[PDB]
Amino acid sequence: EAQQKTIEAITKAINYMAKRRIGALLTIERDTGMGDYIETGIPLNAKVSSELLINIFIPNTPLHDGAVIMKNNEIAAAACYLPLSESPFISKELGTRHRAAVGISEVTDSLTIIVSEETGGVSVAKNGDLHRELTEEALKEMLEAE
Amino acid sequence: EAQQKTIEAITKAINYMAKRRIGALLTIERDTGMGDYIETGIPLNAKVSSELLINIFIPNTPLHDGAVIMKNNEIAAAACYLPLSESPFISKELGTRHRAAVGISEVTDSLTIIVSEETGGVSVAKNGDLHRELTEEALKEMLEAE
Amino acid sequence: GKYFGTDGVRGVANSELTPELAFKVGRFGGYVLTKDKQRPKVLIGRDTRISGHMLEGALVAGLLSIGAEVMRLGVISTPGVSYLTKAMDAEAGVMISASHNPVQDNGIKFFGGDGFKLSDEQEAEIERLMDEPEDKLPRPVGADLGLVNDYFEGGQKYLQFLKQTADEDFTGIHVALDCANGATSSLATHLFADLDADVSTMGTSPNGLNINDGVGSTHPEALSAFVKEKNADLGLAFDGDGDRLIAVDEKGNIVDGDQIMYICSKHLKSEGRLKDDTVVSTVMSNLGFYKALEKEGIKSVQTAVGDRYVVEAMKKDGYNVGGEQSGHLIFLDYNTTGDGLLSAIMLMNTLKATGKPLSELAAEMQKF
Amino acid sequence: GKYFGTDGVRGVANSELTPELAFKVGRFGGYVLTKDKQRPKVLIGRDTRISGHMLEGALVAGLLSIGAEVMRLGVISTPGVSYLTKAMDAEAGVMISASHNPVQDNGIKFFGGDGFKLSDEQEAEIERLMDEPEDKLPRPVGADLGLVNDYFEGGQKYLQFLKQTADEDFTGIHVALDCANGATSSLATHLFADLDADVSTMGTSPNGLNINDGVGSTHPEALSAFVKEKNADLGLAFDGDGDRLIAVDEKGNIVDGDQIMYICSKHLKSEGRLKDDTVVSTVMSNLGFYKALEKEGIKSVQTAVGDRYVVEAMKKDGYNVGGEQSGHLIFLDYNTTGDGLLSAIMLMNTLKATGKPLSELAAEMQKF
């Protein structure tokens, strides 16, 4: 229904940035009402399109420095700040954003995607479990579940 | 009231771009309903904030290529496309985005702000009359009337 | 024959550097680099030259005709190419520019996966194949063809890389900019303005025809008078492709490559980052430059003219700094060929960390 | 030799239709069309073929090498080119597409200033210079080079144009769109959406490799299933370049080009707009097509297959409507070639104006 659009746009946004190695931190709200974490980033309330997401995580802008929050099928806010986790199972040499993505699924029923600004590999974080180097179909099958 | 914000949001966003010489183009609907020009960009329906307008025009992105439209105190759509004016009073120095700014104030009761990507000069277009090289107070006063 | 000189292949566009030739470059130059994987990653960047569009098309037509993945960059300096090619693990990069030369000239230059000039072995085979009058190289078809996805945002990537190398923002400094109407135009003005600095723009208005026309590192006289005019603290004069830097002090005097090299390598030895406290340069450098080096206790090694030798010596010995009189300066901690804005950032680090005007920092070096 | 067939130059791309050829095309053809002003104005469009990027680059390379001013359109339907080349007083236009053919095949088409296929005299001189083994044409240098200013906005000047050719908006009509993963993808969807129609899309997700794959005017069985699935009042099926159109009614049945020619020209006679009440067609047109034409007092001219003869018919005598059983419908009141969307909007005009559903309007002509 309304689930085939907004999922199409997310996949096209993610495949865009992963070919270009642009740091990407994308959280989607499900059951855990993350209202306290939305008020830390620039309010948007904008309808989701692949082009708006790519513009949000551009190298140096006011909005890039953080996460994009996804309540309903809208972009709640951008540049939001999440908790880090300090779990030992984070391979060091990365993190910063990876640490804050597994850190927001440790507290919530949400789902967080990341594109590593060092390699371009698409990650995913559900309930404190991180899966590195996801494929394109892998992300779609994964999202179709949501 | 609710007018000081969204005006403070535009000024600090335009002064952002003027120091860096980024070509902008923002039109502010008033009485002329601009539906047949909002259905030409990437719809958003977002809430106005300084940092979001900045990310919209970044030298080359999906959303950069066109004109920001502002219905209500909402960013109605981005990458919108405006008609050109072909008026002889447009100094042949400039054009493209200044040619459309006056070109959309010819049809409408709208107000356009322009940042010239060659000089950084903030301009403004209302009822076919454009005014180059505007000052900060002169953009703040022009916007307080709306 | 002899297509690949020092700065790659060059010539006056359409007449010598025909679009027919630039296509043959990207088709054979793509096949040499294709020996690893079947879809290599070649990005491409150019300056503002009106020929640049025609050549950019003929080149990519060759790159897609052997199945290479191409990323167009639009207008970006040759530093930005080098930085992105290595930073995206791409198999090579291309620059369509002819640096400081008149507008009617253009050229093609190549960089390896590491961000250095293509090995002379590869350039041999490219020339080998430009002599067989038979195009018996493969012709992929269907989905085997090349792919294209633009990356015009690669600008601010390299720009994001430049911003961090500032020890701090340059608040309280009025700087004039001469961009030669080149690839540095839209790039530089973002940089120092985002670093909180009073910017005054000239040569920041290209139109594909006005590259290096009375402006740039090769004709600093226009910037000399403009600095005094806006009474700037200094002025920076990049060239066409943004690989050289020629500074001008508040007095309006010109500040050449050897005065920039001294001013910066002294500040680096202070921060200790100067590796082994040595600097590399060419025969062209001035005598007093070395005398002033001695006075600060900085060793030095010398190499031939041309920067493929300046880079060769820093390589084997692991040296930090190296440049030319030309204003072509290489910081190997950061980039792999001569960066004009990165040299400019390091000069501003000096001016802010010490607080002296640029005339005073330059006077430490007494030209013979 | 023989480069210009019916739909311009064709061949599977890279192996046959080579980028070397596509450069010879715009360099020699641009010269043939440069004979008036020393700076012609050719604008160039293409479909979604992944080879379309290769040839477009190689094409523009030739045009820039003889001084022609080039406007890139990007992805737009071939009817859009013809409308823009004429509505901009530009000297010619080029469409890199190979309608309804597989993704591997591509082709160069040429339109004149008026919007028709180039005069057979010019196409002759084009293959003339392709036979001389000496590229002895002029090679402008410096300022005299070609010029390229992108016009990706032509997509909506062609869209604005179709918007007015809707006698009113299609509120309350649900339509299912198959655009063949071709040029009409982004165009058609906006059109009927801003026309306040209940749009339902499929085959509107192109990726340079899926064009004309089980979708489009040639493979209608996907839409037919789809139209019944979402119970849409009708289905429209453009092709890869958007010049043909195949309709699907609410029952799911197919509505070929003869049937759409009947539906529209019948409704046009009711508005006095059918010139002399005659329609041009082909030998390929079914017998019952002509049987129900006379039943409505509409005369008919028959010509040979190929729309260069259906347009030649409508040329010498000033007729209003012609077309083929293929779905290639020409409405000379608005455009110079076959238009899928213009054909589509005329159909929508008939659907809204009589209220009747499409099955009923198509039942008046009985196929033999």
Residue numbers in the entry:
A (entry chain H), B (entry chain I): 107 to 252
C (entry chain F), D (entry chain C): 2 to 369
Extract from the study:
GlmM is a phosphoglucomutase enzyme catalyzing the conversion of glucosamine-6-phosphate to glucosamine-1-phosphate, which is subsequently used to produce the essential peptidoglycan precursor UDP-N-acetyl-glucosamine. CdaA (also referred to as DacA in some bacteria) is a membrane-bound cyclase with three predicted N-terminal transmembrane helices and a cytoplasmic catalytic DAC domain. c-di-AMP is formed from two molecules of ATP by enzymes containing a DAC domain. As part of the current study, we investigated how the activity the B. subtilis c-di-AMP cyclase CdaA is regulated by GlmM, a phosphoglucomutase enzyme required for the synthesis of an essential peptidoglycan precursor.
The GlmMF369 variant lacks the flexible C-terminal domain 4 and was constructed to aid subsequent structural investigations. On the other hand, diffracting crystals were obtained for the CdaACD:GlmMF369 complex, in which the GlmM protein lacks the flexible C-terminal domain 4. While obtained under two different conditions, complex 1 and complex 2 were nearly identical and overlapped with an r.m.s.d. of 0.22 Å. Furthermore, in both complex structures, three complex molecules were obtained in the asymmetric unit and each complex was composed of a GlmMF369 dimer and a CdaACD dimer in the inactive dimer configuration. The three complexes obtained in the asymmetric unit were almost identical to each other, as indicated by the superposition r.m.s.d. of 0.15 to 0.20 Å for complex 1 and of 0.15 to 0.16 Å for complex 2. In the complex, a CdaACD dimer was positioned in the large groove at the top of the GlmMF369 dimer and formed interactions with domain 2 of GlmM. Based on the atomic-resolution complex structure data, we suggest that GlmM inhibits the activity of CdaACD by preventing the formation of active head-to-head cyclase oligomers.
